[PDB]
């Protein structure tokens, strides 16, 4: 056995071969046959399968990845030469295990894990161009051009300092092109914010992809990366050989996974509470309990949380459809706008909170900065590709950021001209903006555009503009005071689980009754506007809201009740920003 382990090459290979052949959900042989035609020599294996089949083999694999993976490679190559014994491949099959030890508490990582295979979920923050690293340096004498080679000189290259044919002094210089290189890509990946319990200091890790699996993860992608934990010394000065007693650590990736829920009890419970006739109203009430007397705004933000159903219009040639719901809460200071924004950001997973001011710690834009490598840094919008971007103080923004917001709300993507290349980062986010009117208070008789001073197009992109004000009503003040004092002297968890289940499983689809109701409502709106009239964008908003409401009810199909609720909510928002 290899020193300091429990590993036998022959026995380990035989056990891996047995696992490949004798298994029940055989998938490995199926994908071996698939690789035959495809030619893709990378056999991905879920380590949990080995754990179930043989826990001892799984433990052995985790403990000594570097020494065990080659045995699996050899076994797979022998099998491929057994099944389909005749075939052509530039390099024999390779195995890249994954999903083995979800020690995703990156903040909780220990030196005991050094040189052990581990899988961690997170969002890649930055990358770099593939680095060619030498593996067989080639040298030629300045005097006599005596060619020589130095192979795998343990990272560094051993300069001969003396020739071998004229045996002159140190005159043999390296020839870069004649040498041999391998691909090594560096990635900086941040720990997934959701998994962190406290998240006081999000953790970051460095990954190296070697000889393959390069450029397979773009910046901002949320993936599960499985690789070997590594610790390497850092020299105090390159000239001297002294090394720090504290090692810097990184990961050598082995596999990338781009990315049921709970148990039967949770699905049963959510279905049961869905059966309630007033589940919509009850869910609205549960959302943001601190707030008071706001119902239409709460229902709108809830529908935004659920959002419309994802739809594929690639065949139709109409381009991507904005299934997300964008809501702008416009109100005077002290109407609890920021409280709602924070609460929504504190509830939805993978949500992002930002301020319209350029001083915001996050920033609503992405840009290239020197490391001194000019690498891209993502913005809040790109960061929350499928989450919810709660923008506060949305009124105060620069024209460039306004154009960026218009672009992202229109095409669901952000165009960045890095160097000379234009990159379209997909950002299908749900924008929840909050705006406070200019001046101390909101001047009535002035349109929201006049009193907020934002482009008409940009606000027309929003599918719901909710106007909230502090009425000069003594009764309202008394009620609010009673509510606050009572707060002085349904848990969010179940709501979050319900939203997650709705997003994961259900996908509302239109219905003939719903179609006719939509058409009738739109023509009625048109007729009303015959005497800010109706626009087809309003129809898109209505259909999206109806789909979201159906998702809330878990109907899986848009229903006339959903159409009625969507129309009523849209009319309420219209009234809120209406004037005449």
């Amino acid at each position: 056995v290899i020193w300091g382990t429990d590993v036998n090459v022959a026995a380990c290979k035989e056990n891996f071969q047995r696992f490949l052949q004798r298994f029940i959900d055989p998938l490995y042989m199926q994908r071996l046959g698939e690789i035959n035609v495809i030619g893709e020599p990378f056999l991905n294996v879920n380590c949990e399968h080995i754990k179930s089949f043989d826990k001892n083999l799984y433990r052995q694999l985790i403990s000594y990845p570097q020494e065990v993976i080659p045995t699996f490679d050899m076994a797979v190559n022998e099998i491929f030469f057994d099944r389909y014994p005749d075939s052509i491949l530039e390099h024999q099959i390779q195995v890249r295990p994954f999903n083995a030890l979800k020690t995703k508490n990156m903040r909780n990582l220990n030196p005991e894990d050094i040189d052990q295979l581990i899988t961690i979920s997170g969002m890649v923050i930055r990358t770099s161009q593939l680095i060619p690293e030498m593996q067989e340096a080639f040298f030629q004498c300045q005097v006599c051009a005596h060619t020589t080679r130095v192979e795998m000189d343990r990272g560094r290259i051993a300069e001969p300092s003396v020739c071998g044919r004229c045996h002159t002094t140190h005159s043999m210089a390296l020839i870069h092109n004649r040498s041999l290189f391998s691909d090594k890509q560096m990635i900086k990946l941040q720990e997934s914010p959701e998994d962190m319990p406290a998240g006081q200091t999000p953790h970051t890790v460095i990954l190296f992809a070697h000889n393959d699996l390069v450029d397979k993860v773009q910046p901002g992608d949320r993936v599960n990366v499985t690789g070997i934990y590594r610790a390497v010394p850092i020299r105090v000065n390159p000239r001297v050989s002294n090394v720090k007693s504290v090692y810097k650590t990184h990961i050598d990736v082995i596999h990338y996974r781009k990315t049921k829920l709970f148990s039967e009890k949770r699905v049963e419970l959510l279905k049961e509470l869905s059966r309630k006739p007033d589940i919509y109203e009850r869910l609205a009430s549960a959302l943001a309990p601190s707030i008071y007397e706001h119902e239409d705004i709460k229902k709108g933000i809830l529908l935004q949380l659920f959002g419309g159903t994802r739809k594929d219009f690639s065949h139709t040639g109409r381009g991507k459809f904005r299934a997300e719901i964008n809501i702008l809460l416009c109100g005077d200071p002290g109407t609890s706008k920021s409280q709602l924004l924070q609460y929504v950001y504190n509830l939805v997973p993978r949500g992002q909170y930002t301020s319209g001011k350029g001083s915001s710690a996050v920033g609503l834009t992405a840009y290239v900065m020197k490391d001194r490598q000019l690498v891209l840094q993502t913005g809040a919008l790109v960061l929350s590709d499928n989450g919810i971007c709660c923008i506060d103080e949305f009124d105060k923004m620069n024209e460039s950021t306004r154009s960026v917001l218009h672009e992202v709300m229109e095409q669901q993507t952000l165009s960045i001209a890095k160097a000379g290349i234009i990159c379209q980062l997909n950002a299908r986010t749900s924008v929840l903006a909050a705006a406070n009117p200019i001046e101390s208070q909101w001047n009535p008789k002035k349109t929201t555009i006049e009193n907020i001073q934002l482009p008409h197009t940009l606000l027309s992109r929003f599918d719901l503009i909710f106007l909230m004000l502090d009425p000069q009503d003594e009764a309202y003040d008394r009620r609010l005071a009673h509510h606050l004092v009572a707060l002085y002297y349904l848990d969010m968890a179940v709501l979050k689980d319900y939203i997650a289940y709705a997003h994961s499983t259900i996908m509302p689809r239109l219905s003939e009754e719903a179609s006719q109701a939509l058409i009738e409502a739109y023509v009625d709106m048109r007729k009303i506007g015959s005497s800010v009239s109706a626009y087809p964008r309003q129809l898109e908003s209505l259909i999206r809201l109806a789909e979201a409401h159906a998702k809330v009810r878990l109907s899986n199909k848009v229903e006339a009740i959903d159409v009625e609720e969507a129309k009523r909510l849209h009319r309420e928002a219209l009234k809120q920003s209406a004037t005449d």
Binding site: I114, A231, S241, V246, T249, V362
Partner: protein, 607 residues
């Protein structure tokens, strides 16, 4: 002067034969059970309480204090010898280091006189860590008192963490494998840096003179979690005319990730030098941490507390030399006593003082910084930072339930403004230097001072017109006081008389109540912090009535007076702070009325 073998015998006897009756008087060997758990790999760190040692051998404790590293090693060796005896189950070989150790032991036992070098280092037979807890007899030592004389002695200090580095793996026993002999080489490491070995010292290669070149391997080697932090003198112990001093602390093992910046902690550890030459070598010192723990009168005194004017008296004691500003002083006292946070409610009472130059604002801020137990003073850094790779708490973090007095507020950077806005909204500071949003707990009352731009305040110009601060930011503050230096011959004459008396006697003019000594004020403040008064539902009716009345008045007022729910929250906070001052667990009509009066007086000060 003493036989360390005898010391090893004594420590083994102590560990074997120490028992303190646990829950329900259960006679249990407190350290025997821990030894069992260590033998089963169920524990990693074994903290030893020097009080227990003092239970039967004060001399041993004194020797440990006089020399700590030696006795730490002695205890570690004793535990290493004892562990096999207490082992009872062949626990699953956790990690790879356990199996590696098992293989090494099997090979060694598969062997006789042998050279001292040709044996495994003790530190390689490990994964049990030892630490000491300082005796109750030894009082905590101020950082300034820890000098070169105490180097090598176990000491307990108390301070505030100012920065902590990320956990990293530090090598303890480097392991190398030769190229020819197939043996193994080991290298204990104590220095922060080391020279990796090159040619193996193996007997086989030496005899065969093969010149086998060693290759370092991480799997064989042994690492330990490591963190470098800086602990600063807590403001209570700092001399009046000095500044806090800092001590570097090297946390390792299980002690890692047990402290955060701004934490008021107590550290027991060994004070040792690090040599990273006038009449001898010169070295920098540090503190090898062992235990880190995050910390949180006469009858006449009570009679004075019972006095109705008591509170007023305390107001008179807030910077007595500052003539006038009585209500401002009262508000400052309310800030000092803070809220209650009954559950949770933000208990910090943020106050801002906007005024023309030369109205004692800075002096007031300085006095508050001197009186508040935990205090920070700044002018506009304030927020945390990421130094180069370590978090460094700013003044706001250093407050951490204290009070941050920010003079010259109007000259603060916009980013700092946003930061303080976040501090007043969530009591947390979000900072990102490398695209990482780190959130730190900064829960601290804020006392800001600002000056109107372009000279003295112009009454004819509305707020934010004579000042260059966002209106919303001002509305965040619970109390906003405008101080105007209106020339009034009577009042000006009074002030002049006061100043002249001060200059002629180095003391303020005599008053009705003599100002109380700062220490007594602090004591009373803490006593008030003890209470957490409630708000009876009955009082709610009156509070709501008052709120609706004042809001109606604001609507009647042509100029908006920032009235909102924030105002009601502030009213409640002030009422509960006054209740704390009264030492009564139930608010009273009196307190509510007084809070309302203060709020009205602020808004009038904006007149």
């Amino acid at each position: 002067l003493k036989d360390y073998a005898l010391e090893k015998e004594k420590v083994k006897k102590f560990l074997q034969e120490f028992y303190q009756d646990d829950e329900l008087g259960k006679k249990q060997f407190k350290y025997g059970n821990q030894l069992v758990r260590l033998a089963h790999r169920e524990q990693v760190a074994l903290y030893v309480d020097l009080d227990d040692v003092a239970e039967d051998d004060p001399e041993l404790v004194d020797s440990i204090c006089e020399n700590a590293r030696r006795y730490a090693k002695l205890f570690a060796d004793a535990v290493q010898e004892l562990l096999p005896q207490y082992k009872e189950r062949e626990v699953v070989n956790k990690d790879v280091l356990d199996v590696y150790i098992e293989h090494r032991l099997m090979m060694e036992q598969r062997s006789m006189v042998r050279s001292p070098q040709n044996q495994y280092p003790a530190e390689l037979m490990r994964r049990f860590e030892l630490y000491f807890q300082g005796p109750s007899s030894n009082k905590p030592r101020v950082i300034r008192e820890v000098r070169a004389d105490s180097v090598g002695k176990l000491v307990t200090v108390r301070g505030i963490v100012t920065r902590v580095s990320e956990v990293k793996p530090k090598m303890v026993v480097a392991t190398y494998t030769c190229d020819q002999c197939g043996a193994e080489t080991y290298q204990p490491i104590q220095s922060p840096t080391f020279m990796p070995l090159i040619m193996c010292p193996s007997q086989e290669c030496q005899t065969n003179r093969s010149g086998g070149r060693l290759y370092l391997q991480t799997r064989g080697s042994r690492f330990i979690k490591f963190q470098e932090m800086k602990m600063q003198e807590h403001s209570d112990q700092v001399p009046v005319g000095n500044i806090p001093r800092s001590i570097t602390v090297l946390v390792e093992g299980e002690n890692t990730r047990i402290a955060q910046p701004g934490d008021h902690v107590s550290v027991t550890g060994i004070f040792l030098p690090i040599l990273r030459v006038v009449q001898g070598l010169l070295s920098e010192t540090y503190l090898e941490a062992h235990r880190i723990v995050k910390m949180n009168l006469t009858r006449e005194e009570l009679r004075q507390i019972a006095e109705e004017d008591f509170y007023e008296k305390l107001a008179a004691s807030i910077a007595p030399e500052i003539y006038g500003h009585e209500d401002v002083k009262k508000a400052l006292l309310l800030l000092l006593v803070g809220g209650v946070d009954q559950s949770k409610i933000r208990g910090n009472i943020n106050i801002c003082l906007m005024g023309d130059p030369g109205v004692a604002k800075s002096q007031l801020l300085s006095y508050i910084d001197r009186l508040a137990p935990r205090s920070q003073y700044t002018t506009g850094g304030l927020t945390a930072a990421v130094l180069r790779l370590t978090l460094e708490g700013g003044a706001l973090v250093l407050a951490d339930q204290g009070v941050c007095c920010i003079d010259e507020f109007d000259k603060m950077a916009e980013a700092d403004r946003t930061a303080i806005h976040e501090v007043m909204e969530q009591q947390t500071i979000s900072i990102a230097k490398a695209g990482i949003l780190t959130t730190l707990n900064a829960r601290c009352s804020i006392l800001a001072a600002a000056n109107p731009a372009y000279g003295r305040y112009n009454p004819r110009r509305s707020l934010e017109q004579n000042i260059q601060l966002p209106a919303a930011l001002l509305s965040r503050f619970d109390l906003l006081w405008l101080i105007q230096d209106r020339p009034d011959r009577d009042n000006d004459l009074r002030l002049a008389q006061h100043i002249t008396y001060v200059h002629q006697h180095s003391r303020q003019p005599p008053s009705q109540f003599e100002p109380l000594d700062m220490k007594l004020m602090r004591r009373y403040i803490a006593m008030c912090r003890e209470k957490q008064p409630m708000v009876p539902e009955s009082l709610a009716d009156y509070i709501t009535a008052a709120y609706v009345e004042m809001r109606r008045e604001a609507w009647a007022s042509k100029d908006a007076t920032y009235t909102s729910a924030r105002t009601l929250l502030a009213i409640l906070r002030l009422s509960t702070a006054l209740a704390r001052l009264r030492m009564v667990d139930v608010v009273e009509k009196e307190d509510v009325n007084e809070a309302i009066r203060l709020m009205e007086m602020s808004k009038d000060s904006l007149l």
